[PDB]
Design a protein around this motif. Structure first.
Motif, mmCIF file in Angstrom:
data_model
loop_
_atom_site.group_PDB
_atom_site.id
_atom_site.type_symbol
_atom_site.label_atom_id
_atom_site.label_comp_id
_atom_site.label_asym_id
_atom_site.label_seq_id
_atom_site.Cartn_x
_atom_site.Cartn_y
_atom_site.Cartn_z
ATOM 1 N N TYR A 120 19.359 7.599 -12.907
ATOM 2 C CA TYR A 120 19.006 8.842 -13.540
ATOM 3 C C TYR A 120 19.689 9.999 -12.889
ATOM 4 N N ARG A 121 20.505 9.726 -11.894
ATOM 5 C CA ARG A 121 21.433 10.594 -11.215
ATOM 6 C C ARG A 121 20.921 11.775 -10.424
ATOM 7 N N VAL A 122 19.789 12.371 -10.667
ATOM 8 C CA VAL A 122 19.300 13.506 -9.940
ATOM 9 C C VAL A 122 17.818 13.254 -9.704
ATOM 10 N N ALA A 123 17.342 13.374 -8.486
ATOM 11 C CA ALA A 123 15.978 13.118 -8.136
ATOM 12 C C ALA A 123 15.495 14.063 -7.077
ATOM 13 N N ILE A 124 14.196 14.199 -6.893
ATOM 14 C CA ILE A 124 13.729 15.081 -5.876
ATOM 15 C C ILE A 124 12.645 14.468 -4.988
ATOM 16 N N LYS A 125 12.563 14.773 -3.689
ATOM 17 C CA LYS A 125 11.576 14.225 -2.786
ATOM 18 C C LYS A 125 10.922 15.263 -1.892
ATOM 19 N N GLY A 126 9.668 14.924 -1.599
ATOM 20 C CA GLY A 126 8.826 15.512 -0.578
ATOM 21 C C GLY A 126 9.068 14.901 0.795
ATOM 22 N N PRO A 127 8.244 15.085 1.817
ATOM 23 C CA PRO A 127 8.531 14.552 3.130
ATOM 24 C C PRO A 127 8.246 13.074 3.365
ATOM 25 N N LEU A 128 8.973 12.368 4.221
ATOM 26 C CA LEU A 128 8.689 10.970 4.507
ATOM 27 C C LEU A 128 8.637 10.655 6.003
ATOM 28 N N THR A 129 7.528 10.056 6.373
ATOM 29 C CA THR A 129 7.514 9.541 7.710
ATOM 30 C C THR A 129 7.575 8.041 7.483
ATOM 31 N N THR A 130 8.134 7.617 8.599
ATOM 32 C CA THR A 130 8.514 6.280 8.916
ATOM 33 C C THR A 130 7.496 5.646 9.858
ATOM 34 N N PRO A 131 7.058 4.393 9.782
ATOM 35 C CA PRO A 131 6.271 3.693 10.780
ATOM 36 C C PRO A 131 6.796 3.672 12.190
ATOM 37 N N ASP A 174 3.945 -4.302 3.413
ATOM 38 C CA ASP A 174 5.228 -4.578 4.007
ATOM 39 C C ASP A 174 6.337 -3.682 3.508
ATOM 40 N N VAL A 175 6.209 -3.050 2.358
ATOM 41 C CA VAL A 175 7.376 -2.375 1.900
ATOM 42 C C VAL A 175 7.422 -0.860 1.870
ATOM 43 N N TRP A 176 8.315 -0.358 2.713
ATOM 44 C CA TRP A 176 8.479 1.065 2.898
ATOM 45 C C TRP A 176 9.510 1.734 1.951
ATOM 46 N N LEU A 177 10.541 1.053 1.469
ATOM 47 C CA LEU A 177 11.520 1.608 0.552
ATOM 48 C C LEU A 177 11.796 0.496 -0.442
ATOM 49 N N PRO A 178 11.228 0.473 -1.621
ATOM 50 C CA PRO A 178 11.380 -0.597 -2.555
ATOM 51 C C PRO A 178 12.788 -0.625 -3.065
ATOM 52 N N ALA A 179 13.387 -1.798 -3.248
ATOM 53 C CA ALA A 179 14.752 -1.875 -3.737
ATOM 54 C C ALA A 179 14.956 -1.092 -5.044
ATOM 55 N N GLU A 180 13.924 -1.021 -5.857
ATOM 56 C CA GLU A 180 13.883 -0.311 -7.112
ATOM 57 C C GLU A 180 14.261 1.140 -7.029
ATOM 58 N N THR A 181 13.659 1.914 -6.149
ATOM 59 C CA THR A 181 13.892 3.314 -5.945
ATOM 60 C C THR A 181 15.355 3.604 -5.771
ATOM 61 N N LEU A 182 16.073 2.766 -5.074
ATOM 62 C CA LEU A 182 17.444 3.057 -4.828
ATOM 63 C C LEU A 182 18.154 2.958 -6.146
ATOM 64 N N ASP A 183 17.738 2.117 -7.075
ATOM 65 C CA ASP A 183 18.413 1.962 -8.355
ATOM 66 C C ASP A 183 18.089 3.077 -9.314
ATOM 67 N N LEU A 184 16.881 3.562 -9.322
ATOM 68 C CA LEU A 184 16.542 4.598 -10.225
ATOM 69 C C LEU A 184 17.067 5.902 -9.721
ATOM 70 N N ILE A 185 17.431 6.154 -8.461
ATOM 71 C CA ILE A 185 18.006 7.444 -8.136
ATOM 72 C C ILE A 185 19.429 7.428 -8.647
ATOM 73 N N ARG A 186 20.179 6.342 -8.454
ATOM 74 C CA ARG A 186 21.563 6.291 -8.923
ATOM 75 C C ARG A 186 21.646 6.265 -10.436
#
Lengths: 414, 414
Positions: free
Chosen positions: B93-104, B79-91
């Protein structure tokens, strides 16, 4: 008041979705502002030539001046930018042609190009862009571009439904959005401007019905639907799904491999028209990179605007891309460019876009011999490297000709 | 649950709008779906190399895996595509990097790229596109393109305020439009889909403030505002006027000749930054035709998307165009391309876009020697003509290298 109907000439008529075109037809023309005073004389002289040659003297267009834009205020009251009259004479004489129109700034009057397109329900904006052998191009391989655009003209964001930021109406609609519809995604509501983008079924199917019907008539290989639909599911994503529904239901489309793309029967030829989709940002890239895979494009009003102008640039023509606005009851052929007032009156600008829209006007009346003659004419004027300012800063050993003189170079080559 | 904080590493911190960056910093990275399993190993190996070389061993990034997209469902509940956690750890540790994301598909979940960009208020999408000497290009003169895009990320049509056609809500809003606001310009209301495009003052000024502040910091010649504003007066036409107001009020702009364009003082250099505007369809053409006249671009979310992807194509890179989403409190660097699942796992795709966004991540932390080293590295790997599938179908006498092997070619050249 002030438009004078000519003495000899008969009005074109509609019978069974087809046009009955007189030997001596009346065609209205709007001269245009700015460079319109230069390119509209070249267009009339060369169309007249191309039918004296083709029908060895038996057919002759009778031209009738009607008014819009700046020249209209001169002709009536300073207040009127699109006289109610013009809208009636385009629908009555059924086929008309225009030069460029600028609109007054700010001052209420909406883009006159779109007032005409919307008030006469000219829902297909058709923009074919192909390369003419010998044009200076920015890109390496421009001969691979031979595309035809069906841009939808009645809807999208381009309709003009917008309210000023901090208008009493803008606050009326954002309050309705937050209170009654539960909209949280608006980042800044104070001092915010709003626009509405509508997209419907009966509007997207009449445009994609014409695009598939045109691929059948002209023996084309594919119809691509472009949409930025992974982000806008219900307006552009809806237009992708509604255009596929229509090729399934009215044209008998069938699945390739197992999706998403369909295959459609040519009844006249038995060849296989592919129906595909590209999301519009990737498409903008696809047109520079793999241009032979695309042929007829079907898209919404804003997408079709950007794609056309980009494709016209690619192949070497901001200034010779033809245009037509088409509806069930009439049609208007137009120059696609600006008014360019700096270079106006001087006779130096390119007349190619209005002449090639008179070509498109002639193919539609069914006078294809006079039209094929106007394109034989343009391919030679350019092969012979005799051309206008805009194609001479760009190349070697070309002879510089004025605008009225370049039309005379089109007649020479037909 | 499941993200493991490393043992040695300190969190980056904000003090006075500036970052305090540890010698041993923690940087989160989201691997990505599809080709992410291939390009994210190349990026980590080469950034690690570029700081062992630059700081001769004194600094070292400590990498921490966080999750979004497909890999997140594997890691928690389907069920979970963007965990609430991720949003907290980007803010945090302030700088983060990502690869590509597709959506359902379809299924409620909105483009994950924009869920992250909007939920973390990353209002600047910065997309620099320049040419690397020796890349196969579609166009004739690609060295003339050195542009930087500030695409606004919080608003426009791209926000996602849309209702399904024949939804109970869609009929709720079209009834309000016809009855309470006097809207006649909707051509077909039955079976019609609606979207909302908002544009505000505090949102368009925070984006154009960053674009002028970046031109000042990097000694750039002009800032162009693109907008399709002759048709959309109150959203895109408003953003042109609000960006000019801001260069007058906060940056002391002054009139050139007598308009519309302004001149702005560089305080650090005394050179003259021009502030101009091009309507977006003409701009799409202007970028192929007169590319040296443009440098920094400021535009809205949908315009910036199309312009970036088009500019990336022009110069030879759908697949090596770097990206950054930036906000006041944190930043996310991303690969710009798709997931491309057909070619995934096989290690053949280009890692250039994620590596060059790690470059952009390093310049922002203030580690410019390690970043200039990653660009010395990419210019040589390409000069030496040693490259991936996507640059080898296109040219003569290149040696074919895999994705993990092309990162090793970047280290060789620095």
């Amino acid at each position: 008041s002030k438009v004078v109907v000519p003495a000899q000439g008969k009005k074109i008529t509609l019978q069974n979705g087809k046009l009955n075109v007189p030997e001596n037809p009346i065609i209205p023309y709007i001269e245009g502002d700015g460079i319109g005073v230069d390119v509209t004389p070249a267009m009339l002289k060369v169309v007249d030539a191309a039918v004296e040659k083709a029908y060895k003297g038996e057919r002759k267009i009778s031209w009738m001046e009607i008014y819009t834009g700046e020249k209209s205020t001169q002709v009536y009251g300073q207040d009127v930018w699109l006289p109610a009259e013009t809208l009636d004479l385009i629908r009555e004489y059924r086929v008309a042609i225009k030069g460029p129109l600028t609109t007054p700034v700010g001052g209420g009057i909406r883009s006159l190009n779109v007032a005409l397109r919307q008030e006469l329900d000219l829902y297909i904006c058709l923009r074919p862009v192909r390369y003419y052998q010998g044009t200076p191009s920015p890109v390496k391989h421009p001969e691979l571009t031979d595309m035809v655009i069906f841009r939808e003209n009645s809807e999208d964001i381009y309709a003009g439904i917008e309210w000023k930021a901090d208008s009493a109406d803008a606050e009326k609609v954002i309050k309705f959005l937050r209170e009654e519809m539960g909209v949280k995604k608006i980042r800044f509501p104070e001092h915010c401007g709003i626009g509405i983008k509508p997209c419907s079924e009966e509007g997207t199917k009449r445009l994609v019905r014409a695009a598939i019907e045109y691929a059948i008539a002209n023996d084309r290989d594919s119809v691509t639907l472009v949409h930025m639909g992974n982000i806008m599911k219900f307006t552009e994503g809806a237009f992708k799904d509604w255009g596929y529904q229509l090729a399934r239901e009215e044209f008998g489309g069938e699945l390739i491999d197992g999706g998403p793309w369909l295959k459609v029967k040519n009844p006249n030829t038995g060849k296989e028209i592919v129906i595909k989709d590209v999301i519009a940002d990737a498409f903008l890239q696809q047109i520079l990179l793999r241009p032979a895979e695309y042929d007829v494009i079907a898209c919404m009003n804003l997408n079709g605007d950007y794609i056309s102008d980009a494709l016209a640039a690619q192949v070497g023509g901001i200034g010779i891309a033809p245009g037509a606005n088409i509806g069930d009851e009439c049609a208007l052929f137009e120059a696609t460019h600006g008014t360019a007032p700096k270079y106006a009156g001087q006779d130096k600008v390119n007349p190619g876009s209005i002449i090639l829209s008179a070509e498109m006007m002639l193919r539609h009346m069914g006078w294809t011999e006079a039209a094929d003659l106007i394109v034989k004419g343009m391919e030679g004027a350019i092969n012979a490297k005799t051309v206008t300012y805009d194609f001479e800063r760009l190349m070697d050993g070309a002879k510089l000709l004025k605008c009225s003189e370049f039309g005379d170079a089109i007649i020479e080559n037909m």
